[PDB]
Amino acid sequence: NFMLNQPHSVSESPGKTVTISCTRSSGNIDSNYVQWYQQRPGSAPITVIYEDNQRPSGVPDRFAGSIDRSSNSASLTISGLKTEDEADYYCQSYDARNVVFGGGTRLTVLGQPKAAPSVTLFPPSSEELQANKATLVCLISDFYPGAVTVAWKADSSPVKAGVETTTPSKQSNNKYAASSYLSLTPEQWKSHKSYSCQVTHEGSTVEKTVAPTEC
């Protein structure tokens, strides 16, 4: 029982080389075969690497797998990037009876310039508090590529309960927007000194914080 940790995203221009790392949390990376899967948006998954570095028939030489024992990491390298390489890439392995997939890496083959998001965090409105709702909204606009990861904190502690995040959406300026909202009760909201919204984009992380007031 172990995790495989991949970064959330990578991006490059057509024709360049990109590397996707996959770090095993406990145990040796070399003691079990590592596979790589590609899933293009709205497509079936395809195996691009099995047994660490083996390509199935039809998978071009541009895809290369490797293992690094000292890092305890596997890597998928894609050279001569093409637009059709734009996909989610997952590593998986085993130990004992456990099958383990990594969390996935979104690879974007850049189709326009990179744009860091505007992150605005809204505390509960008066209208919803009178309805025993303390829902928070994290608004994320004007970003590219259209992939983000959102994490919420109550004080310092992570929150998984009550989190919904929209699929990013192309807006009229041709950049992506999304919202994350946290469905709190006024009780939970007033019982903490602050809440935070963490937005990660192109491996850059921004944190916004709000505290209960009165007014």
Ligand X SMILES: CCN(CC)c1ccc2c(C)c(CCN3C(=O)NC4(CCN(C(=O)c5cnc[nH]5)CC4)C3=O)c(=O)oc2c1
Tokens of 103: 């969390």
- CA 157 vs CA 8, 40, 144, 192: distances in Å: 21, 34, 29, 11
Closest CA to 21 of 2, 41, 43, 6: 6
Q: Which residues contact 52 (CB under 8 A, 6 or more apart)?
A: 33, 34, 65, 66, 67, 74
Residue 61 or 97: the one with the smaller Cβ distance to a second copy is 97
Residue 129: contacted member of a second copy, ligand X, none (CB under 5 to 8 Å, by partner type): none
Q: Give Cα 49 to chain centroid, integer Å.
A: 21
- Any contact of residue 109 with a second copy (CB under 8 A)? no
Q: Which of 12, 46, 53, 122 binds ligand X (CB under 6 A)?
A: 46
Closest CA to 71 of 132, 125, 25: 25
Instruction: Please identify which residue in 27, 50, 72, 185 interacts with ligand X, judged by CB under 6 A.
Output: 50
- CB burial of 49-74 (b: ≥16 within 10 Å; e: otherwise) equals bbebbebeeebeeebbbebeeeebbb
Q: Looking at beta carbons only, is 51 or 187 nearer to a second copy?
A: 51
Q: Give the one entry of ligand X, a second copy, none that residue 169 binds, where binding means its C-beta sits below a cut-off of 5 to 8 angstroms depending on kind.
A: a second copy
Asked if 94 touches ligand X (CB under 6 A), the answer is no
Q: What residue 134 binds from ligand X, a second copy, none (CB within 5 to 8 A, per partner kind)?
A: none
46 binds a second copy (CB under 8 A): yes
Q: Is 110 in the site for a second copy (CB under 8 A)?
A: no
What does each C-alpha distance from 120 to 181, 187, 209 come to in angstroms? 12, 23, 10
Asked if residue 215 binds a second copy (CB under 8 A), the reply is yes
- Residue 182 binds ligand X, judged by CB under 6 A: no
Contact residues toward ligand X (CB under 6 A) are 37, 39, 44-47, 50, 56, 90, 99-101
Contact residues toward a second copy (CB under 8 A) are 1, 35, 37, 41-47, 50, 54, 56-57, 88, 90, 92, 97-104, 118, 120-123, 125, 127-128, 133, 135, 137, 139, 141, 164, 166-167, 169-172, 177-179, 181, 208, 210, 213-215
